Amino acid sequence: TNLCPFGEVFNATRFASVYAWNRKRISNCVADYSVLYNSASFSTFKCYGVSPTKLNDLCFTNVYADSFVIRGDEVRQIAPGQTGKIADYNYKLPDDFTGCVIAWNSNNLDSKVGGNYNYLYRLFRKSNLKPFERDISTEIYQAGSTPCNGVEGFNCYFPLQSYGFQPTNGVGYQPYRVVVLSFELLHAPATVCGP
Amino acid sequence: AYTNSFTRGVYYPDKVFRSSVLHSTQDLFLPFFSNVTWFHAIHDNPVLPFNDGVYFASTEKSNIIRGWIFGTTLDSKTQSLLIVNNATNVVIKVCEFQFCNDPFLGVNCTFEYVSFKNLREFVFKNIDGYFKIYSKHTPINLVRDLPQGFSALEPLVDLPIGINITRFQTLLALHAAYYVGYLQPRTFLLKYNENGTITDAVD
Amino acid sequence: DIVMTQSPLSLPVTPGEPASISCRSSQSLLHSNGYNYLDWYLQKPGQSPQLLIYLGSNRASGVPDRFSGSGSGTDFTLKISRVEAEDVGVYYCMQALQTPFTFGPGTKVDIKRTVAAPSVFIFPPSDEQLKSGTASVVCLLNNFYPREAKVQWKVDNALQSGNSQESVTEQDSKDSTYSLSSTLTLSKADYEKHKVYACEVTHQGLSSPVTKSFNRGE
Amino acid sequence: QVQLLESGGGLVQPGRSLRLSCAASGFTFDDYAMHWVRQAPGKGLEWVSGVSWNSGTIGYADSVKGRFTISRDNAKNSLYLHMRSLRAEDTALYYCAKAVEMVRGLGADPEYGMDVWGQGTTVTVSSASTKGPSVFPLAPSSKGGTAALGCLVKDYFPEPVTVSWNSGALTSGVHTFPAVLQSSGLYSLSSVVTVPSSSLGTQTYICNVNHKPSNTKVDKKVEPKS
Ligand SMILES: *[C@@H]1O[C@H](CO)[C@@H](O)[C@H](O)[C@H]1NC(C)=O
Ligand SMILES: *[C@@H]1O[C@H](CO)[C@@H](O)[C@H](O)[C@H]1NC(C)=O
C-alpha cells in the first residue's frame, strides 16, 4: 500500500497561469479520494461523471491533473457547457467529461501588496479553442485588415493581459486556485485503484 | 518501381477477445490492393510523409535496417522520436538529437524506453498522445518482392509522448530494400476464428 | 528590504590558525519552524562561487568537516578550525526569509605575512601628451602590505577629486605583496599652468605620509 | 553529470532587449527552484531573480523591478530571462544556480542553497565605436637602484588587450593592472617592470601590445629621455 502524491499538487507554492495550465500525469498508485472530499478548505468541489461518494471503487487506466489560477468571478466558466471567454480562449473542457473540479480561494498567498505581474491571461485569438489544446506561443495579433509588421500601434495588439490581483478588492476579484482532475479508462490494465 | 499490396495491413483494434465471430469495425487501415512505394538500397533513404501513420514492411536477410527518426524540425529543436536497434539494445528515445543526417556508426530530452530471408512488417499510428506500434515477424524464402498471403498484425507497444509528426526517415548502417504504404479510414469485416485470430477480412 | 553587515571587513589569516567571521541582520530570521534561513557562500579567486553552509549550521554536502557555523537571532558566525593554503577568497552571507534575498558586502580572506612598506614612484605626461590635449599623470606603489593604503593628488595645495582614479592587483603568490596605481587626467588648459604636482601616500608602515613631487619645466 | 549552460551575451546599446537562456542537463529539471544571480565587474554578487518548482516566480531585486521578466519551461529543460530597457549600469556576469532541497522532502517549500553554478556570460552595454589603443611611454624617474618603467594603454574598446615585455622573455618583475573604465567608456590600463637603474641607460627594453579585435600588434621601445 503506497499512497499517491496528491500533496505535491494541491500544496504547490505557486500555480501556473491560466493560458499555460500545468498538466500532470498520475499512474501506478492507490489514490486516496477520502481526503480530497472531506477537506474543509475548498469552496467548490464538483464532480460530473461520477458522484464523489463512490470514487473508492472505480479503477481508471490513467488520470491527469490540470492546475492553474483564475479570477474569483470567472470560476463559473469551468464546466462542459457554460461557455464564455476563459473557457473559450484558454482552457476548454470536453463535452463528455468524466472528472472533477476543485477550486478554492487563496487570497493571502497569490496576491502581493503593491500589485502582482506573474499572472497573465490570453485575449484576442483567431478562433475558439478545441478541447484541451494548449497554446503557449505568443505572436503579435491583428485587429482588422492591417499588415502586421511586428508593429502593435492600433494595427496588432499584444494578446496577453496582466491580472492586477490587488489585496484589497472585493471577493469577486481575488485569485482562486483551480485543479481539474480528468479520469481515463483507456484499454489497458487498471493502473490505479482506491483501497 | 511500385508494388501491389495484396492484403497486408489488418491488425487487432480492440483488446477484448472474440471467437469464431464476424465483427465489422471502422478504423484506420491500409486499403486492399494499393500501390506501395518500393525503395532499393543500391549505391533509398529520403524523407517520407507521415500523414496518417505508416505501414512499413522491411524484407531482410542482412539486418542493416536500424530504426526510425520521427519529427518535423529534426535538429535539436523539438522532441523528435527515435527507434534504434543494435545487437543488444532496443532504445526508444525522444531527445532533441544534434546530428543532422543519419545518426549511426559506419562499418533537451523528456522520456526514453528500453527492452530477403525474413519479413518484418510494422504499422505506426498516433492517436491522442498515444503512439502505437504494431509489429509482426514472418519467415520467408524469396528474393524479389512482397509475397502473396494473409496474416494478422499483433499490436505490440504504446508510447505516451503526444507531438505533431509530419515526416519520418528510416536509417541504416554505414560502411537492401523495403516497402512503404499509407493508411486511410476504411471499414473492414474481420473473421475472428476459433482461437481468436483474424483469418480473413473484407474491405 | 533587509540589509546585512559582516565583520571584520577584511582579515588576514595564516595557515594553521582558526578563523571567525560574523554576519549580522536587521530582522531576526527565526521562522515559525524554528530554523534560521541564513546561508554561507564562498568564492575562490577566478572561479564561480560555491556553497558552504545552508540552514544556519546544517553543513553542506561535499565540503570537509573543518568549517563550523553557529549563532541565531540576528547574529551568526562561521569558524574555520584549521585554515590552510586553499582557503583564500571572498565570503558572503545570504538571507532566505523575506524576498528579495540579499548578499553581504563580503569578507576578503588572504594570507598574512610580515608588514612591508611600499616603494613609490611618479610619472609625468610625455611629449605625446603635449600635442594631444590629454595630460595624464601616474603614481605607482609596489610591494606593500596590507591592502589598506590611500593617496592624495596635490597641485599647489589645491586638492582635487573625481578625476583621479586608481587600480590595484592581486596578491603576489611568492612574497604576498600588493601594488596600487593612481592616474590623474586633465585637459591641455590647466596642466601647463600649475607647477608642482605631488602624490601623497598614507600607509601604516610609514611614520608619516610620503610626498613625491615633481616640478614643471625644471 | 549536472551541467548548467547559459547563452545570450554580447554588446548591446542602451535601450534595447536581450534574452538570456540557461539549459540544465543531468537531473529532474522541474524538481529544483532555479535562480538568476548577477555579478558586477570586480564587485560582490547580487541576487536578480528566481523561479520555484511550479513555474511561479518569487520576485525580483528592488532596483531592477519593472523591466526583467523570467520564464521557465520544464518540457525543454530551459529557463529564460527577457531583459528590456537597459541602462549602462546592467553590465555584469550572470550565473544560473540551482536549489538543494527536493520539493516535499523536509514547513514551507525550499528556496535556499544555490549549490551548482554554471560559468556565466559577459553581458555588456555601451555606445562607442570600436577604437584602437593608444600607447604611451613611462620613462624611468631618473632620480636609482631598481627603478621602474612602463607603458600605458589608453582609449581602447573593447577587451581584452595583452601586453608583454621584451617580446615575451622578461617575466620576473612585470606588473599589469586590470582595465579601469573611463568617462566615455574607452578603457585604460598600464604595465610596469622594475629594472636596475645603472642598467637603464644602455640596455634594451620594449613592451609589445596586442589587440585582437582591432588586429594590431604594436611595438614600443621605452628608454629615458632627457
Ligand atoms: C497538504 O496536502 C494535504 C493533502 O491534500 C492536506 O491535507 C494538507 O492540509 C495540506 N497542507 C498544506 C496546505 O500545506
Ligand atoms: C538543447 O535544445 C535547445 C532547444 O532550444 C537548444 O537551445 C540547446 O542549445 C540544446 N542544448 C544542447 C544540449 O544541445
Coordinates of C-alpha atoms in Angstrom, one line a residue, chain C residues 1 31 33 35 37 39 41 43 47-51 54-55 58 92 94 96-97 99-105 121-124 126 128-129 132 134-136 138 140-143 165-169 172 179-181 183-185 212, chain D residues 35 37 39 43-47 58-62 95 100-101 107-109 111-115 117-119 135-141 143-144 146-150 152 154-155 175-182 190 192 194 220:
Chain C
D1 CA 14.3 45.0 2.0
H31 CA 10.9 31.3 11.1
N33 CA 9.6 26.2 12.1
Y35 CA 15.1 27.4 11.6
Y37 CA 17.5 30.8 6.9
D39 CA 23.4 30.7 4.1
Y41 CA 28.8 31.1 0.5
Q43 CA 34.2 32.4 -3.8
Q47 CA 36.1 30.8 -10.4
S48 CA 32.4 30.5 -9.8
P49 CA 31.4 30.7 -6.1
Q50 CA 30.4 27.6 -4.2
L51 CA 28.1 26.7 -1.3
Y54 CA 22.8 26.1 4.4
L55 CA 20.1 26.4 7.0
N58 CA 23.5 22.4 8.5
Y92 CA 29.1 36.1 1.7
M94 CA 22.6 35.3 2.1
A96 CA 16.3 33.3 2.6
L97 CA 13.3 34.6 4.7
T99 CA 12.1 38.1 -0.7
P100 CA 14.0 39.7 -2.3
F101 CA 17.1 37.9 -1.0
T102 CA 20.4 39.8 -0.3
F103 CA 24.1 39.2 -0.2
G104 CA 26.5 40.8 2.3
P105 CA 29.3 43.1 1.2
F121 CA 57.3 56.3 -8.0
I122 CA 55.8 59.2 -10.1
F123 CA 55.3 59.6 -13.8
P124 CA 54.5 62.8 -15.7
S126 CA 55.3 62.5 -22.1
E128 CA 52.9 62.6 -26.8
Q129 CA 50.5 64.4 -24.3
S132 CA 47.1 65.7 -28.0
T134 CA 45.1 65.0 -22.9
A135 CA 47.5 65.0 -20.0
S136 CA 47.9 62.0 -17.7
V138 CA 50.6 58.2 -12.9
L140 CA 52.9 53.9 -8.6
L141 CA 53.1 52.0 -5.3
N142 CA 54.5 48.5 -5.3
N143 CA 55.4 45.7 -2.8
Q165 CA 41.2 57.1 -10.3
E166 CA 43.1 54.1 -9.1
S167 CA 43.5 50.3 -9.5
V168 CA 45.2 47.5 -7.6
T169 CA 46.4 44.0 -8.5
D172 CA 51.7 38.2 -5.4
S179 CA 50.6 47.1 -5.9
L180 CA 48.4 50.2 -6.4
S181 CA 48.5 52.7 -9.2
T183 CA 46.1 58.1 -12.6
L184 CA 45.1 61.8 -13.0
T185 CA 43.7 63.0 -16.3
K212 CA 56.7 62.5 -4.1
Chain D
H35 CA 17.8 31.4 -9.6
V37 CA 22.3 35.9 -10.0
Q39 CA 27.9 39.6 -10.6
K43 CA 32.4 43.6 -7.1
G44 CA 30.2 41.5 -4.9
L45 CA 27.3 39.3 -6.0
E46 CA 23.7 40.4 -6.2
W47 CA 20.5 38.4 -6.4
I58 CA 9.5 34.7 -6.5
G59 CA 10.0 38.4 -7.1
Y60 CA 12.9 40.4 -8.5
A61 CA 15.5 42.7 -6.9
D62 CA 14.4 46.0 -5.6
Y95 CA 25.0 32.8 -13.3
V100 CA 19.4 22.0 -3.0
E101 CA 16.3 20.6 -1.2
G107 CA 7.3 23.7 6.9
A108 CA 7.0 25.5 3.6
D109 CA 8.7 24.7 0.3
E111 CA 14.2 28.1 -1.9
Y112 CA 17.8 28.4 -0.5
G113 CA 21.0 26.6 -1.3
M114 CA 22.5 27.9 -4.6
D115 CA 24.9 24.9 -4.9
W117 CA 26.7 27.2 -10.7
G118 CA 27.3 27.4 -14.4
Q119 CA 30.0 29.7 -15.9
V135 CA 50.3 53.5 -26.4
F136 CA 52.2 55.9 -24.1
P137 CA 55.6 55.7 -22.5
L138 CA 56.5 55.8 -18.8
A139 CA 60.3 56.5 -18.7
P140 CA 62.3 55.9 -15.5
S141 CA 62.1 58.6 -13.0
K143 CA 66.0 60.2 -9.6
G144 CA 68.2 54.9 -8.6
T146 CA 65.9 49.2 -9.1
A147 CA 63.9 51.9 -10.9
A148 CA 60.6 51.1 -12.6
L149 CA 59.4 52.0 -16.1
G150 CA 56.4 51.0 -18.1
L152 CA 50.2 52.9 -20.6
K154 CA 44.6 54.4 -23.3
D155 CA 41.3 54.8 -25.1
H175 CA 53.1 44.0 -13.2
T176 CA 49.9 44.6 -15.1
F177 CA 46.7 46.0 -13.6
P178 CA 43.1 45.3 -14.5
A179 CA 41.4 47.5 -17.1
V180 CA 39.9 50.5 -15.4
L181 CA 36.9 52.2 -17.1
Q182 CA 36.8 55.9 -18.1
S190 CA 49.1 50.1 -17.8
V192 CA 55.3 48.4 -15.5
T194 CA 61.3 47.3 -12.5
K220 CA 57.2 50.3 -28.1

